[PDB]
C-alpha cells in the first residue's frame, strides 16, 4: 500500500492524461512529488529523435519551479492503460538526477508500489 | 520588431531561468505562446541519452494543458546569456509537431526576431 | 553537377538499404567518406527514446575505425525512396562533430547536390 | 564462467577501443554476436541530443549486415575501465529490438558474466 501522497500522484497523472485529446504524440502523463510536498505534472512529446517521455517533462517542470529533490514519480498511459513503469531511458535520467527518487510500478499482484530507482536498474 | 506577445515570451523565459539555482543540469528556460494566447514555460534536463532541451519541456507542458497549436517559442540561457537559437534536434521536433510555429532568434544585429521554423531547417 | 565520390556514396548507401529485409525498425542506410580514404555505412535503429538515425550509426562506425574526418555523407531510404536529407538532430551532431562535412540532399529540381552542413542549419 | 564465443566479444570490443585515439566523444566500444556467429562492433558518439551509445551503433551495424537476432553484447570503456553495464536507454532499446539478448556485465567479484536483458529491466515498461 502506497503512502497517501503517492496515491495522489496516481490521481493527478491520471486526471492529466484523461483531460487531453486522445493523441499518438501526447499519450502518457506523469506526476512527481518534491521533498517539500509540491506536485509537478507533464505529458510526453513523441518524436523519433527521442522526444521526452512524460517523466522527463515532469523533471523539467520541477526544475523550472526550483523544486529540488523529487521523492516519487508515476506515469499513466492514455485510454485507461493505467500505471506504466518508467522506460529504461527515464530510469537512467532519474537515477542520475534524482538518485533518492522512487517510481510507482505495478507489483507482481498488479498493485501499485513505490520502488527505489536503483532497484529498477539492477546489476 | 517583436510583437507585445512575443516580447512577453522573452520576459517569461528570462524570469524563469533567473529564478532557479545555477545548475549544469538545468541551464536554459523556454516559453511558448499557444494560439489561444496562453504562455507555457519549461527548463531543460541535461542528459547524455538526450535529456530534453527547454523547448521540448515546453511542448510537453503545453500538451498537458491541451494547448493545441504553439505559434511562437523562445529559449533563454542562464547566467544572463540571452536568446539561444533552438538546436537542430529542437528544430526538427518543432517543425514536426508545430509546423506553424516561429522561433525567436537573434538577427544579424543581435536583436530579437521571430522566424518561421522552416527558415531554420530547410 | 556531382563528384565521383558523391555518386559512389549514393550507390553504397543504396546497395546497403536494398540488401536488407524491409523493416519498420531498419529503414534507412547512410554512407560517408573519410579524408583517409575509406567509406563507412550504417542503418538506422528506430526507437522512441531516440534510436540513432543511419547517419549517427555511420559516425560511430567511422569512429570505431579511427576514421577522423568525414568529408561527405548521404542517407537513402528503403523501398526506393532515394536521398533523404539529414533530420535536425543529425544536422546538429554532424555540425558539432564534423564541421567540415557536406551532406548530399535534393536541390530544387530533385537532383543530388552536396551542401556544407552549416547550410542545413541556417541562422 | 563465460562461453568461448561470449569471451571473443570482450576481446573484440577491447581491441576496438584500444585502436582509436583517446577521445571525450568516442570513449566506449561495443561488440555483439549474431545467431550465425558473426560479430559486429561500434563506438559511441557523444552528443547532448542523445548521440548513440556504442551498443546502439552495434545495433545499426548488425542491421546493415542483415544480421537478424543478436544473442549477446558487451561494452568496454576507454581509460582501461573494462566492462560497462548498458545504461538504461540501451537496456530498453536492446530489450525492445532483441528481447532474447544477453548483456555481459561484471558480477559481485568484478568478473564477466552474461545476464538476460530482461533481468536488467525489472517491472518492465510494456504498453
Ligand atoms: O491480437 C492482436 C495482438 O494481441 C496481443 O497484443 C496486443 O495486446 C497486448 C496486451 O494488452 C499489448 O501489450 C500489445 O501492444 C498489443 O499488440 C498479442 O500479444 C499479440 O501477439 C497479437 O498480435
Ligand atoms: Zn521513458
Ligand atoms: Zn534543442
Ligand atoms: Zn537524423
Ligand atoms: Zn547506453
Describe this structure in words.
4 copies of one chain form a homotetramer. With 123 residues, chain A is α+β, with helices and mostly antiparallel strands. Chain A has one domain: Cytidine Deaminase, domain 2. The first copy, chain A, is built from 3 helices and 6 strands; from the N terminus they run H-E-E-H-E-E-H-E-E. In chain A, strand 1 and strand 2 form a beta hairpin.
User: Structural class of chain A, please?
Assistant: alpha+beta
Quick one: which chains have the greatest interface? Answer: C-D, 33 and 33 residues
Overall 3D shape of chain A: globular
* Helical amount of chain A: 25-40%
Order of helices and strands of chain A: HEEHEEHEE
CATH class of chain A: Alpha Beta
CATH superfamily of chain A: Cytidine Deaminase, domain 2
Pfam families (chains A, C): dCMP_cyt_deam_1 (PF00383)
EC number (chains A, C): 3.5.4.23
Family (chains A, C): Belongs to the cytidine and deoxycytidylate deaminase family.
Binding site for substrate (chains A, C): 27, 81
Quick structural summary:
By secondary structure, the first copy, chain A, is an alpha+beta fold.
Features:
6-stranded mixed sheet; binds a molecule of 2 linked components (GLC-GLC); alpha+beta; binds zinc ion; Cytidine Deaminase, domain 2; 3 helices; homotetramer; 123 residues
Topology of this structure?
Four copies of one chain form a homotetramer.
Chain A: H1 4-19, E1 28-34, E2 39-43, H2 54-64, E3 70-77, E4 82-84, H3 88-97, E5 102-106, E6 112-116
Parallel strand pairs in A: 3-5
Antiparallel strand pairs in A: 1-2, 1-3, 3-4, 5-6
The complex binds a molecule of 2 linked components (GLC-GLC) and zinc ion (4 copies).
One zinc ion (ZN) binds next to α3 of chain C.
Amino acid at each position: 500500500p502506497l503512502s497517501q501522497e503517492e496515491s495522489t500522484l496516481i490521481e493527478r497523472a491520471t486526471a492529466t492524461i484523461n483531460s487531453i485529446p486522445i493523441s499518438e504524440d501526447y499519450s502518457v502523463a506523469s506526476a512527481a512529488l518534491s521533498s517539500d510536498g509540491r506536485i509537478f505534472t507533464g505529458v510526453n512529446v513523441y518524436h523519433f529523435t527521442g522526444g521526452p517521455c512524460a517523466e522527463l517533462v515532469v523533471l523539467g517542470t520541477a526544475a523550472a519551479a526550483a523544486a529540488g529533490n523529487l521523492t516519487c514519480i508515476v506515469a499513466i498511459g492514455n485510454e485507461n492503460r493505467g500505471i506504466l513503469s518508467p522506460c529504461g531511458r527515464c530510469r537512467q535520467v532519474l537515477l542520475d538526477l534524482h538518485p533518492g527518487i522512487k517510481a510507482i510500478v505495478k507489483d507482481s499482484d498488479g498493485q501499485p508500489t513505490a520502488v527505489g530507482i536503483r532497484e529498477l536498474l539492477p546489476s
